[PDB]
Design a protein around this ligand. Structure first.
Ligand SMILES: Cc1cn([C@H]2C[C@H](O)[C@@H](CO)O2)c(=O)[nH]c1=O
Ligand SMILES: Cc1cn([C@H]2C[C@H](O)[C@@H](CO)O2)c(=O)[nH]c1=O
Ligand SMILES: Cc1cn([C@H]2C[C@H](O)[C@@H](CO)O2)c(=O)[nH]c1=O
Ligand SMILES: Cc1cn([C@H]2C[C@H](O)[C@@H](CO)O2)c(=O)[nH]c1=O
Ligand SMILES: Cc1cn([C@H]2C[C@H](O)[C@@H](CO)O2)c(=O)[nH]c1=O
Ligand SMILES: Cc1cn([C@H]2C[C@H](O)[C@@H](CO)O2)c(=O)[nH]c1=O
Ligand SMILES: Cc1cn([C@H]2C[C@H](O)[C@@H](CO)O2)c(=O)[nH]c1=O
Ligand SMILES: Cc1cn([C@H]2C[C@H](O)[C@@H](CO)O2)c(=O)[nH]c1=O
Ligand SMILES: O=P(O)(O)O[C@H]1O[C@H](CO)[C@@H](O)[C@H](O)[C@H]1O
Ligand SMILES: O=P(O)(O)O[C@H]1O[C@H](CO)[C@@H](O)[C@H](O)[C@H]1O
Ligand SMILES: O=P(O)(O)O[C@H]1O[C@H](CO)[C@@H](O)[C@H](O)[C@H]1O
Ligand SMILES: O=P(O)(O)O[C@H]1O[C@H](CO)[C@@H](O)[C@H](O)[C@H]1O
Lengths: 290, 290, 290, 290
C-alpha cells in the first residue's frame, strides 16, 4: 500500500463572516502565503505526494484555480466537492474512489503545525502497518475540540467531542493517519445528535478496538489557532516573526518539494523566473544559488 | 441627488504574490472585514452614497458578487473594469459617464483612514464648491508617494510623484475630492516618466490654478496602506486593538448607513440575519437595541 | 512652570507579577520609551510644566534618577512617596503642599492617550474657572472602571466605581482636572468597601454640587489599555505602528518641550547626542535642523 | 557537585535608550515574566543548578531582590558585579573563583530559545569532556553577530564577529559551554574595537585547536531577537501566542524546577500560596493538581 492525502478545506465559514463571504477561509493569508499552503506542506513533509483537496461547491474551484494539478511541485492534486459541511468523517466517503485500497492521511485545511523534527514526529504514524494515529496537544480550551482522556499510566482511555466537562486539556489536532479501514467505517457511521459525521466517532472505534495510537505533540511545537479573527492575526504575526528572523520561509511548498527531491533545480528556476520581480520569486531563485 | 465617489480597487497585486494569486487584494481581511469595507466606509462617512467601483477584468465581478447594487446599505453601487493599471487618473476617464456633470471623490481601495473628527474633515472638502482637496500626511517613506513641497510659511507650492529626492516627508494620501473639472483634466494627461496617467499631474493643475486645498492631516490621524505582507498584518492588529478596547467597530458599513440614516432599524435587522451567528451580526443586532 | 499636574505612578504591582516584582509598572517600556513618558507628555500638551510624580518608597528614587528636576526639558519636576497604595484620591493628600492654593490636574501613570486635537480637547478643562472636568470613553468592559451614567438628554447623572451592573459603557478615563477645592475633599474622604480612597468619590462630590463637566472623548481617540500583560503588548504594538508609519514619535517629551518653546536648539542637541545611537536621538537632532 | 553556569545580565544597553536608562534590559518583560527568566530556564533545562549572575553596580541588587539565593527553586544562585561593561569574556575573569576548576556554561541574559527537545539539543554540549560547544542559527542579518562558516562537509572553518562580508548566514547564539580552559583564555584576551573582551575571540581559540563544536539549531527552533524595540515587542507577542494557546508557560523557572525534581509539590504549594492573588500564583498552584 501507499498513503494518499486528503486536505479538508470546507466549512460553512460563518464564524468568520463577512471576511469569509469574500474569501474562503483556507485562502486567507497567514503572513506571506495562503493558509492552505501550511497543511499542504505538512503532508509533503510526511512524503505524501498524491493529495485530494475537498472544499465546498463555491470554494473548491478557487483552490483548483490557485494550485492546479500540482505538477509544478512534483505532486498530483485532485479536487472534490463536499456538498454541505456535514462532518469531518465525510471526507472518507467523498474520497472513496481516490483512496482506493490505500492508507490515508487527512489534515484540516486550517491546521498549521510548526516545530523542530516534525517529520520525525510523524514518522511512526506514517510507517504504521494498520490502525490509526492521532496527535494530542495541550490547550487551554479543550472544550472546542475532540478531547482525549489518559489514564494514570499515560494510556488513552476515552475520546469525547466538544465535551462540556472536559476530562483533560489534551486536544486531538487536525492531522490524522489511518489504514484502509476508515472508509467503510465512515460509510457505516451515523450522524451525531448534532447532525454531523464525526471524526471523533471514527477515532473511538479504533480506540475501542485497541488500534488507536495517540502520540503526544509536545509544548515545544506550535499548533496555531485559526478559529477567530484575532487568532488569525496572531498566527500571521507568529509566522512573520519566525520568517523575518531567519530569512527563511515556514511551509513554502516549492522549497519543501525541492529539498525533498520531488523537483529539481531546473524546475525551481523555471518556477522562479516569471516571479523574479516579487520577493517570493527571489526566495525561490536564491534557493537554487546557495 | 446622491453625492458621488469612485473606489479604485484594481492593480496587478503582484507585490503580494501568492496571497493575491487567487484573491483580490482589496477583498483580503483587515482584522474582521474585507479590505474594501474601509474606503467604502470612508466615502459613506463623507456623505457619499452613489459609488462606482473599478477593478481588473478578473476581480471586478468578485466585488459585484459580494456587494451587489448596494441598496441593502442604502447606497447605489455600480462597477467598471480598468483593462490595465495605467494610472490613478484613469479612474476619471473610465468614470466619465458615471460622473456626468457632478463633483466626484476618489479613494484607493487599499487605503485605511482613522481618527477623531475624520467625518468633519471630509465634510469640509465635500462642501468646497470649486477646485479640489487632497490631504498631506507625514510619512517615513515619502518617496513611495506623491510628495508636497512647502514654502517658508507652510504653503504648498509644488507636488512631485515618487521623487528620487523628496522635498518633504508629507505624502498625498489616497483620498481626493474634485469638482467636475477633473474629467477634462484627466482626458488631457499624457503618460508620465513611469508611463502612467498620474493623479499627481491633476493635482498640480489645480495647485497652479490656485484651486488646490492641501489639508494637513495631523499626526493624531492614522492613514495606513496595505503595501506589504507585513503592513497588512500591522493594519489588522491596529484595527483589532481599537475595536477590542472600545467594543465599537471601525468602518462597519452597516453601522455607518444606520447611523447616517441611510437605512432604518428594520433594514439593519435584515442585514444582521446572515451574520447573526457571529460577533459581527450580534454587533449589528445590539445596535438596534442600544 | 506655573500650572500644575500630578502623575500618580505607584500601585501594588500585584496584577503583573512577576514583571513588576523588581520594576515599577510605570518604568516598563511602551515600544520605545518608558510608560511614564506618555502621561507626562499629556500634561505638557495641556500646558502644564510644574509636575509632581508620586511613586512607591522603592521606585520614587528610580524616577528621580531618570528624570531629575526636569530642567533639562524646561519643566519643574518634584517627587513624593506614597507609603501604601491606599487610593487614587490620596494623590491630593500627598500632593497637598505641591498644589498650594492652585488648580491641579491628575493623570494616572499608566494612562496612554493618542489622537487628533487632544490639546484642544483638554482646553476647556484647563481653562475652567471652578469645578472639575473628567473625560468619558466607551469601552467594552466598563465594569473595570468608574462608570458614568447618562440621562435621556446628554447629562451625566451618576458615577459608580467598578459596578457589577454597569449603567452605561462609558468609563471615566485616568485624566482629571480640578480646582483647589479637591484637596479638602480628599482629606475628608473615607476609604470605600475596597479599602481605597476613591477618585470616583471626589468626582461624585463635584457632580452632586453641579460643578462636574463630563467631556466625551470620542471613538476617534485611542485610550490604550495597560492593565494586563497582553494589553501592554497591544499598547506597544499600537504606538510602534503609528510611529513607524509616520516617522514621528508619539509622546516624546523632548519634542514637545522643543515645539512648545520650553527649550532651545542647543539644549535639544545636547539631549539628542547621548541617545543618538538609535532612532530616538537621531529623531531629536533632526528636529532642530532644518 | 552541581554543574555551573553564568548569566551575564549587565551591559549598558545604549541601543535601547531611553527604555534602558529606566530599567535593566534583562528586567524588561517578555510577555508575562522578566527577560532573565528565559536564559535562567535554559540553564535549568541543561541540568545546571549552581549559577552565578553578573550585572552592573546598579542592577545587581535588583536581580538579587527578584531571585534571592535560589534555594526556593532548588538552585544555588550567587552574584557578582561587573564594574563596567567591558565584554562578554570578562564573565570568566569575574567568575574565576566561582568556576574553580570546573566546566562552566555562559548564557547571555537576553538569549531566549523556544522549541521541541531543547534539553536533548544541549545534551552533548553539557557532557563534553574537553573543548567548547556553541550553537549556530540561520538569520537574515548575520553581520550583527558572530558568524560561523562551514566547508562542504559541514566542518566549521572560521568564526568572525560582525563580519563586513559574512561568510555564511549562520549566527552563533548566546549560549556557550566551556571546559575549564576558558578562564585562562579569557585572562589573555585584549580589548575589541568596541572596547570589550569578546566571546568570539574565546571561541576562535577553541576553533584553532580543533576543539569547537558547532551544534546546528534547526529552523524549527526559535531564537527570539531582543536587539531593538520592535523585536522586543515581537518576542513578547511570540511567547504570548504560545502560552495563550497552550494554557502553559514557556520558561517558568518554578515549573521547570518542579518537573526536574529540584523541588517537590509541597515546596511549589509554599511558593504559590502567597501569589494565588495573581495569575502567576494561580498557575503555580494548578501544577500541583490535575
Ligand atoms: C464540519 C466540517 C468542517 N469543515 C472544516 C471547517 C474547519 O476548518 C475544520 C474543523 O471544523 O474543518 C469541513 O471542511 N467540512 C465539514 O463538514
Ligand atoms: C524540515 C522543514 C520544516 N518546516 C517547518 C514546518 C513545521 O512547522 C516544522 C517542521 O520540522 O518546520 C519547513 O517549513 N520546511 C522544512 O524543510
Ligand atoms: C496605477 C494603478 C493603481 N491602482 C491601485 C493599485 C494600488 O492598490 C493603489 C495604489 O497604486 O491603486 C489601480 O487600481 N489602477 C491603477 O492604474
Ligand atoms: C490604588 C492606586 C493606584 N495607583 C496607580 C498605578 C497606576 O498608574 C494606576 C492604577 O490604577 O494608579 C497608585 O499609584 N496608587 C494607588 O493608591
Ligand atoms: C505636538 C505633539 C502631539 N502629540 C500627540 C499626542 C496625541 O496623540 C495627539 C494630541 O493631539 O498628538 C505628540 O505625541 N507629540 C507632539 O509633539
Ligand atoms: C460613527 C462612526 C465613526 N467611524 C470612524 C470615523 C473616524 O475614523 C472615527 C471618528 O470618531 O470613527 C466609524 O468607523 N464608524 C462609525 O459608525
Ligand atoms: C558587553 C556586555 C554585555 N552584557 C550583556 C548585555 C546583553 O544582554 C548580552 C550581550 O550583549 O550581554 C553584559 O552583561 N556585560 C557586558 O560586558
Ligand atoms: C520541560 C520543559 C520545557 N520547556 C520548554 C523549553 C523548550 O522551549 C520546550 C521543550 O524543549 O519547552 C519549558 O518551558 N518548561 C519545561 O518544564
Ligand atoms: O468540526 P468541529 O466540531 O468544530 O471540531 C473538529 O475539529 C477539531 C480540530 O482539530 C477537532 O479537535 C475536533 O475533534 C473535531 O470534531
Ligand atoms: O499610483 P501609485 O504610484 O501606484 O500610487 C498612488 O498612491 C499615492 C497615495 O497612496 C499618491 O500619493 C500617488 O500619486 C499615487 O501614485
Ligand atoms: O486602575 P484602577 O485603580 O483599578 O483604577 C482606576 O483607573 C480607571 C482608569 O484607568 C478609572 O475609571 C477608575 O476609577 C480608577 O480607580
Ligand atoms: O549583543 P552583542 O554583544 O553585540 O553580541 C553578542 O551576542 C550575540 C548573540 O546574542 C553573538 O553572536 C555575538 O557574538 C556576541 O558578541
Amino acid at each position: 500500500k501507499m498513503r494518499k492525502g486528503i486536505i479538508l478545506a470546507g466549512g460553512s465559514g460563518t464564524r468568520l463572516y463577512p471576511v469569509t463571504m469574500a474569501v474562503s477561509k483556507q485562502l486567507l493569508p497567514i503572513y506571506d502565503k495562503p493558509m492552505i499552503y501550511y497543511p499542504l506542506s505538512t503532508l509533503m513533509l510526511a512524503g505524501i505526494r498524491d493529495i485530494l483537496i475537498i472544499s465546498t461547491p463555491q470554494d473548491t474551484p478557487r483552490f483548483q484555480q490557485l494550485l492546479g494539478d500540482g505538477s509544478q511541485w512534483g505532486l498530483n492534486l485532485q479536487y472534490k466537492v463536499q456538498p454541505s459541511p456535514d462532518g469531518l468523517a465525510q471526507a472518507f466517503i467523498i474520497g472513496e474512489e481516490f483512496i482506493g485500497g490505500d492508507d490515508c492521511a487527512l489534515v484540516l485545511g486550517d491546521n498549521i503545525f510548526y516545530g523542530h523534527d516534525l517529520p520525525k514526529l510523524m514518522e511512526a504514524a506514517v510507517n504504521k502497518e494498520s490502525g490509526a494515529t492521532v496527535f494530542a496537544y495541550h490547550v487551554n480550551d479543550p472544550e472546542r475540540y475532540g478531547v482525549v482522556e489518559f489514564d494514570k499510566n499515560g494510556t488513552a482511555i476515552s475520546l469525547e467531542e466538544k465535551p462540556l466537562e472536559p476530562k483533560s486539556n489534551y486536544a486531538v489536532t487536525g492531522l490524522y493517519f489511518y489504514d484502509n479501514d476508515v472508509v467503510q467505517m465512515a460509510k457505516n457511521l451515523k450522524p451525531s445528535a448534532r447532525g454531523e459525521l464525526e471524526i471523533t466517532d471514527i477515532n473511538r472505534i479504533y480506540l475501542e478496538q485497541g488500534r488507536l495510537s495517540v502520540a503526544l505533540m509536545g509544548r515545544g511545537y506550535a499548533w496555531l489557532d485559526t478559529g477567530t479573527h484575532q487568532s488569525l492575526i496572531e498566527a500571521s504575526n507568529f509566522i512573520a516573526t519566525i520568517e523575518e528572523r531567519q530569512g527563511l520561509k515556514v511551509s513554502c511548498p516549492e522549497e519543501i518539494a525541492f529539498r525533498k527531491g520531488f523537483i529539481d533545480v531546473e524546475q525551481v528556476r523555471k518556477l522562479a523566473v516569471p516571479l523574479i520581480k516579487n520577493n517570493y520569486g527571489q526566495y525561490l531563485y536564491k534557493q537554487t544559488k546557495d
